Amino acid sequence: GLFGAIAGFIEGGWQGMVDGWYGYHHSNDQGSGYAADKESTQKAIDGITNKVNSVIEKMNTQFEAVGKEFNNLERRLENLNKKMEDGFIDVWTYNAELLVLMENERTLDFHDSNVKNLYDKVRMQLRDNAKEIGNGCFEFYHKCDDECMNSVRNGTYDYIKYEEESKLNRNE
Amino acid sequence: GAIAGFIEGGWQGMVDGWYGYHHSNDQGSGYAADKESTQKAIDGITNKVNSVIEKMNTQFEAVGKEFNNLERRLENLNKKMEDGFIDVWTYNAELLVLMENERTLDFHDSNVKNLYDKVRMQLRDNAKEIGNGCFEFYHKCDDECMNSVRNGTYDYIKYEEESKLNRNE
Amino acid sequence: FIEGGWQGMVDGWYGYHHSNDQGSGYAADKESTQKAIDGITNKVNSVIEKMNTQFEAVGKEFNNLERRLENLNKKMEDGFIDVWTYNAELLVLMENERTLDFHDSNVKNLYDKVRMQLRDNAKEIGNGCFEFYHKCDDECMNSVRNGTYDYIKYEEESKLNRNE
Amino acid sequence: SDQICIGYHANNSTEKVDTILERNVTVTHAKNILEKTHNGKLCRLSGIPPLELGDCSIAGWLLGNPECDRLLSVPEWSYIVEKENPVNGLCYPGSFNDYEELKHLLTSVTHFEKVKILPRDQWTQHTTTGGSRACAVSGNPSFFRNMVWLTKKGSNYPIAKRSYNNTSGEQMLVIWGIHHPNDDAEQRTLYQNVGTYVSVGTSTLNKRSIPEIATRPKVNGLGGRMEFSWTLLETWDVINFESTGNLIAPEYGFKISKRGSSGIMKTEKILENCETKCQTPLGAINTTLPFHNIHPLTIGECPKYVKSDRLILATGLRNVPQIESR
Amino acid sequence: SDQICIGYHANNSTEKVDTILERNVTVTHAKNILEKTHNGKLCRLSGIPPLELGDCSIAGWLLGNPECDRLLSVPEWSYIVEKENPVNGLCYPGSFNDYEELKHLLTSVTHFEKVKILPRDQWTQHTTTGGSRACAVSGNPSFFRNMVWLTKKGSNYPIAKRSYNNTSGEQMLVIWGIHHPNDDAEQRTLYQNVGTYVSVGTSTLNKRSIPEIATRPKVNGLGGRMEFSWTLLETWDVINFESTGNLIAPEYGFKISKRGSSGIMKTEKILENCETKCQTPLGAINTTLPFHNIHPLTIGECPKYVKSDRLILATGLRNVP
Amino acid sequence: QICIGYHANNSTEKVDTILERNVTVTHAKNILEKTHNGKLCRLSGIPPLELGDCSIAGWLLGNPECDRLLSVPEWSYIVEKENPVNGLCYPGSFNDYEELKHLLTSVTHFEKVKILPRDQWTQHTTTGGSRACAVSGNPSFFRNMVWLTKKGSNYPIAKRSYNNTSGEQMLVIWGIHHPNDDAEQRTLYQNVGTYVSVGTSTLNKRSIPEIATRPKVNGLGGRMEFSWTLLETWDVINFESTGNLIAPEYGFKISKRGSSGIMKTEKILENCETKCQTPLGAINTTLPFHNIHPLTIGECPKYVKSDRLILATGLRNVP
Ligand SMILES: *[C@@H]1O[C@H](CO)[C@@H](O)[C@H](O)[C@H]1NC(C)=O
Ligand SMILES: *[C@@H]1O[C@H](CO)[C@@H](O)[C@H](O)[C@H]1NC(C)=O
Ligand SMILES: *[C@@H]1O[C@H](CO)[C@@H](O)[C@H](O)[C@H]1NC(C)=O
Ligand SMILES: *[C@@H]1O[C@H](CO)[C@@H](O)[C@H](O)[C@H]1NC(C)=O
Ligand SMILES: *[C@@H]1O[C@H](CO)[C@@H](O)[C@H](O)[C@H]1NC(C)=O
Ligand SMILES: *[C@@H]1O[C@H](CO)[C@@H](O)[C@H](O)[C@H]1NC(C)=O
Ligand SMILES: *[C@@H]1O[C@H](CO)[C@@H](O)[C@H](O)[C@H]1NC(C)=O
Ligand SMILES: *[C@@H]1O[C@H](CO)[C@@H](O)[C@H](O)[C@H]1NC(C)=O
Ligand SMILES: *[C@@H]1O[C@H](CO)[C@@H](O)[C@H](O)[C@H]1NC(C)=O
Ligand SMILES: *[C@@H]1O[C@H](CO)[C@@H](O)[C@H](O)[C@H]1NC(C)=O
Ligand SMILES: *[C@H]1O[C@H](CO)[C@@H](O)[C@H](O)[C@H]1NC(C)=O
């Protein structure tokens, strides 16, 4: 807006990044826009897809036909059978609930760390050439157009190139 | 003098909460909890504990059953069932606890690490990162300023100036 | 750590590679490796300390007039197998996820254990290595490995080399 | 003043999940793994329609209660649908030995062929027309269609003696009964002798029943009782009947004509024109999810029933959007 | 020379937990989730006290064994407490058909009302005073209080024929027996005829028993046996007895007067004045925890029994001074 | 320069995780036992009771074709064929048979005691037998049973008891012969409308022969319905019969107790040892799961329906 770009991983999510799950927002003379990290997003989608299939590759092979019938002289037997059917439902119901609960905890942390990695993947490859703002964004000490923007996104950023004037701008 | 951070160990002297700060200035020294960080955890952990306890439970069930001397297979059947469930519950319980304790302790380690980075990021060049989980200021900071670093309203642009002059020797 | 593993480090699990005038070589962190081996050994024993105490003798026999009873028994034996089989599979799956992350974080810690104790005396390359701004021989190398590194010592000339 | 920023996706998802640490957490995406809906309709399983008994019960059907004449011939079945308390069972009051073991036998069989094994025309020394008002077909005393009530022919009940080699090439259910009269007068009226027996022999079966003549409450306006029994005659095995009175003999057996996977489900729903791999008393389940909470008594390839109201896996990010117009 | 430090809480907690990776790890706080203690006392469940049989057994009680006369009338019950091998069951030796099915029937019922359905005064063609030394009430031959031993009245046992329409408005347990004498002499002494029967009819029940007269070892000093049977007479249904000898007929039925949730637990503990939602043979459990390890054979709303000695969740920090 | 890295090797071994599949790791621990020795073995030192073609009923009745089992030592568990050939040579049934069979999944040794010697039925012929129980061409009968029949036109009441003074609990078996017709019933026992009563302190049976025509099994139409009981120590068992009694000569004192089971297999015993036996072979393992065979006997890992369970112990192998 209307309020000055800048939301990073810290501060929140971006509705404007319809592209993928994790990604970059940029700001230069040419303009501003959102862009997903295809690599980071994919590794996650795969991870999460697998997580979901893991829970769903299960047992399942029936037919089983659960209904059973008993005399009025076989109440202990009926009851036995009832405790069994109940016992299994109790187990499956508890494991399921807790499984879901633990795997949701893990999933969200998984996302938080993927995004943090994307941050450090950049931080490490820029260093003194850029100021770490602290909102999950980097202010450049030099200039960087779309040619250079690709380089920082897909990890081919030339630090030795912009090494020079980054220093001169930094020292005031 | 002082200094134990997250690295190095715990502070008995912080009876206040779970995670927090120790400070050292001209006025003095003291411990102080991060109410925000501690709470988020207490809540998390309380929930963890309730999750494990919201369960099944609704009996009456009355487990004892009785059988003839001509119903030994039936008795035995029933025994294998009661045993089978106990084996399942007992194993799941033990392992559940085991995995959730692993997770809890890591949870605490990362909360404290966050509290560290929450500060580090908001101070930067104004302070020297000692490496024991403490920051030595390159400038000066009294209790007014101490509140600001704790509750995240620290003025970096303020002490920006003399931090530099002290740093360069 | 970034970039990959080292076959040349037959020594332990996590460790250091160094490069100075004397030479180059690999060296494990006995401390970091051990804490892990112990952890992982425990993980494996935790899963294996179980139930187990039979005799149980699972085979049971029934009339042609006790088919419901036979079937009951079959659904029980099947039910338990279904439970154990599912829990086992998922247990293994979750604990492997955890183990690999465990390794990644141990190695990351070893990185930060160094980074924090060196700071301006060294340039963080970004591939998980530190280029020194000063010089460091095997005497000094021990110090950085086992955490007794003298920052206040090499503090001086690190600065002069850094500023151009 | 040039800038790069690293962030994550958000959307207008309203969907909440729980975690071990946190509750009602809004996320961008979620996968429900708990099947909650059914179609409301009673359906065919693996193409086959189920055997739908209406008001009849298995005993009514296999004995050939008159009110069950619509089931004198019925095709292959997926599973059996029975009412919880069917109206037409034993028209003539009695009991059925090992009834539930029989009922369980039909949760694997999926088709009978009813073979006439002991035609009634060949009891030429006995009256076979016996019947009663409890089994009345429009006002007139009748009896179970598949059974024969032997009684004295003009002041004599000679020993009744017939066998049957199961040459049908498949295994065969044979049923029979013994009549337990209400008093000695009735026992003579019908069978002339007193102290009578019904023996049945196969290679493995050996029963011998004596009528228990006792006074007892009128069920369906009758005091007598008929206690039915059954057996599986194996292929090429023979079954012998021998009786000096009180035999309710079969005219038909039931060759177990198709095998497979069925069950009995108790419901008052009528069959409809739909398909499933999983049927429940409330309706059928179309799902790929691992759990359902619809109804424990399923038949077919079903998800694991659980007693849970919600199981939702987070797949997406923690949905924490941008303050618009940002 | 001014400093800020970020750290965590420690205390004098000694409490250890285990994790997948680590063992005996001291933590600042922990929540035990495994209930280990019981009060030691046998208690009332949901306010009601349980039916406490002492040395009697269900068969002793329902037949009305004389040594069980303290149970001729007993109020509503939470659950049933029985000894593992009760002394007073079938005073007159015999058996009880479908006994465990009957016992199981009382793990849902919680009160009887004993209704006099066939008063003995109305067997006016038979002697009803039969009894024996095995059921002796202080030296004198007696018999099961709720049963009647029909025998010949002066050289005759006419057909014994009585019915009973269950008009009690609730479902009713009726029990009866057949006497299996030791030899033909005894069978005549008592019932005149030989080759006798006892038939019992309801709308759904149809039994007919013949006495098996055989020589056999003396149990309680007796060679005869009495085989008892039972049935649930449904409301408004009738039960007919017909016998030409060997009938042990009921005087009473047992209207199932209260329904609900009970069980039978085998223990020698006596009831005491306390309360629970969960009772075990060793004592009762007051707990909110999900697991216990006290005893598998509980009755009530109980945590899941496990075979474990400790389950402790870390809630606190790793306690490291 | 200093660099921080991790171990790699030429490991090929793959594991799966919740997030990832077929991930190569440096080290892994299989926790799923997959192998057995192929051999049928002794459990806790003891060898199992190995019936060959005989069945428990053949053995305890003393079917002639089972004469190799007239005396057999203590046993770990019982090995029986799935459909043993020699059971009831003379066709019939065995009341509460599976309950009896189950009784031998806790007992581990019998001693066969002669409780009612046949020499003492001196008012009856004891030599009765048939071609269904033929020992090389000649009609015989179950070795441990005695077929009482009339001695020259008379079957006086047959009346014998036995106080169990063996000091241990004792299995006693008996039968009632159900002839094919009235002619046979008289040929053998004279009288018609007969009984066999058996009394102990807790047992009270009385059986009448059901004389009916029926299909020939083993070329015979008669049937013999066997029953059994545990005579408790110092208790007495009374037999009384006016015809149709198949009386025991022997009882079976339950001589050793413990832990056995019955496993159905055609494998022969061999000279090896285990704490866990299955129909395919035995299991030597410390792992918690196996997938060999559900029907084990002994202290075994939990059977699972799984093809692989492998815990990663090592690093992600990325060389
Ligand atoms: C932050 O909030 C106020 C600032 O007005 C201060 O009084 C308080 O002590 C601070 N809290 C913490 C935990 O530092
Ligand atoms: C907002 O959500 C609605 C449904 O709740 C959906 O139809 C719509 O596509 C969403 N908006 C955007 C921009 O995706
Ligand atoms: C979460 O939401 C549901 C309804 O959507 C509500 O009933 C429940 O009380 C909430 N739970 C918590 C822990 O706030
Ligand atoms: C029944 O018939 C088959 C051939 O159909 C024959 O082999 C057999 O002898 C007969 N069985 C009996 C028991 O008579
Ligand atoms: C089941 O669901 C699938 C969803 O892909 C649908 O296409 C199919 O028609 C459904 N079957 C029935 C009977 O509704
Ligand atoms: C140890 O801790 C407890 C509080 O949990 C306290 O009561 C006790 O006095 C403490 N002792 C010391 C020396 O701090
Ligand atoms: C844990 O502590 C207990 C003492 O309570 C001891 O018996 C056990 O061996 C300990 N285990 C370890 C790994 O220290
Ligand atoms: C029993 O009594 C009721 C009336 O009190 C009557 O309706 C019913 O017909 C009687 N039942 C029988 C089985 O006679
Ligand atoms: C069995 O033997 C002993 C004699 O040694 C005797 O005391 C006991 O009473 C006998 N029991 C019976 C039932 O005969
Ligand atoms: C199992 O195998 C190991 C050697 O691999 C051996 O030491 C152990 O004694 C074996 N046990 C048996 C019962 O064969
Ligand atoms: C694989 O590692 C082995 C260690 O067993 C080592 O000897 C060898 O160098 C490796 N393979 C190759 C081709 O280097």
Side-chain angles (χ1 to χ4, degrees), chain E residues 242-261:
Chain E
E242 187 172 62
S243 189
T244 44
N246 308 68
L247 181 54
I248 308 309
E251 182 164 16
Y252 306 75
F254 292 85
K255 188 171 91 183
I256 52 77
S257 201
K258 244 266 184 184
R259 203 65 78 149
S261 298

Side-chain angles (χ1 to χ4, degrees), chain A residues 89 93 97, chain D residues 32-38 278 280 282-283 285 287 289-298 302-311:
Chain A
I89 286 158
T93 306
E97 305 261 38
Chain D
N32 170 51
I33 63 171
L34 175 76
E35 181 50 61
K36 272 183 263 65
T37 48
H38 56 88
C278 177
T280 91
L282 300 173
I285 297 177
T287 195
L289 309 177
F291 304 105
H292 83 282
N293 72 357
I294 294 158
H295 196 299
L297 306 183
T298 62
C302 298
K304 223 92 207 197
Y305 175 77
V306 298
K307 277 174 172 73
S308 184
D309 278 310
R310 107 180 315 230
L311 299 163

Side-chain angles (χ1 to χ4, degrees), chain E residues 146-280:
Chain E
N146 307 325
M147 317 304 284
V148 178
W149 192 353
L150 300 187
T151 37
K152 66 184 199 199
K153 201 132 88 82
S155 315
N156 198 38
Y157 192 115
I159 205 162
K161 213 153 138 50
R162 292 269 291 289
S163 73
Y164 169 80
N165 186 329
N166 178 10
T167 51
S168 80
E170 198 52 36
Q171 194 168 46
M172 205 179 71
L173 167 63
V174 173
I175 290 155
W176 70 98
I178 180 184
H179 176 223
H180 293 309
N182 203 57
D183 64 339
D184 283 355
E186 188 184 338
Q187 165 72 32
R188 294 215 191 79
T189 303
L190 291 166
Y191 318 115
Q192 174 117 328
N193 284 310
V194 202
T196 294
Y197 67 86
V198 173
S199 50
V200 175
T202 78
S203 64
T204 63
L205 185 81
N206 171 31
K207 274 181 195 147
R208 186 193 205 73
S209 313
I210 286 205
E212 301 166 55
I213 298 160
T215 283
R216 18 168 126 76
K218 281 181 280 138
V219 178
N220 303 342
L222 265 44
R225 295 288 185 269
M226 301 205 305
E227 161 191 294
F228 291 96
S229 294
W230 63 275
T231 192
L232 263 58
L233 194 47
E234 212 68 29
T235 59
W236 319 109
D237 189 14
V238 167
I239 184 171
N240 290 81
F241 289 94
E242 187 172 62
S243 189
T244 44
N246 308 68
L247 181 54
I248 308 309
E251 182 164 16
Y252 306 75
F254 292 85
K255 188 171 91 183
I256 52 77
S257 201
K258 244 266 184 184
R259 203 65 78 149
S261 298
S262 79
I264 290 168
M265 68 176 242
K266 319 235 76 204
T267 182
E268 48 279 307
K269 282 182 172 291
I270 62 167
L271 174 139
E272 307 210 329
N273 198 7
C274 61
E275 183 68 38
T276 352
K277 305 291 156 200
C278 177
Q279 183 73 62
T280 91

Side-chain angles (χ1 to χ4, degrees), chain C residues 1 5-6 17 56 63 96 129-130, chain F residues 2-4 6 98 298 312 318:
Chain C
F1 74 91
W6 298 333
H17 174 86
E56 93 275 36
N63 297 351
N96 295 338
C129 299
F130 300 106
Chain F
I2 204 168
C3 286
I4 291 156
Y6 52 82
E98 296 66 31
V318 176

Side-chain angles (χ1 to χ4, degrees), chain D residues 239-291:
Chain D
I239 183 170
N240 292 78
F241 290 95
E242 187 172 62
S243 189
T244 45
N246 307 65
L247 180 55
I248 309 308
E251 182 165 15
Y252 306 75
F254 292 83
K255 188 171 92 182
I256 52 76
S257 201
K258 244 266 183 184
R259 203 66 78 149
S261 295
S262 79
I264 289 168
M265 69 177 242
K266 320 235 76 205
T267 182
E268 49 279 307
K269 283 182 172 291
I270 62 167
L271 174 139
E272 307 209 330
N273 198 5
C274 63
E275 184 68 38
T276 352
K277 304 290 156 199
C278 177
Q279 183 73 61
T280 91
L282 300 173
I285 297 177
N286 187 18
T287 195
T288 90
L289 309 177
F291 304 105

Side-chain angles (χ1 to χ4, degrees), chain F residues 53-113:
Chain F
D53 298 337
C54 287
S55 80
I56 275 75
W59 165 44
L60 301 174
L61 292 174
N63 177 333
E65 302 295 320
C66 303
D67 279 352
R68 61 186 316 286
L69 308 183
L70 288 174
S71 185
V72 272
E74 194 188 352
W75 66 82
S76 308
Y77 53 107
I78 291 158
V79 174
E80 198 182 37
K81 306 276 181 185
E82 187 62 54
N83 293 107
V85 180
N86 312 116
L88 271 45
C89 57
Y90 197 110
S93 62
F94 208 116
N95 297 321
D96 292 315
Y97 185 41
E98 296 66 31
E99 283 294 302
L100 184 60
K101 288 163 75 77
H102 179 73
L103 184 71
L104 320 171
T105 75
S106 74
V107 50
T108 41
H109 200 227
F110 285 137
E111 165 162 22
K112 183 167 88 179
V113 176

Side-chain angles (χ1 to χ4, degrees), chain A residues 19 37 43 60 68 89 92 104 115 128 140 146 165:
Chain A
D19 207 323
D37 193 22
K43 198 56 170 272
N60 180 273
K68 298 174 60 56
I89 286 158
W92 281 109
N104 293 337
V115 174
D128 77 81
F140 289 114
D146 295 9
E165 73 270 44

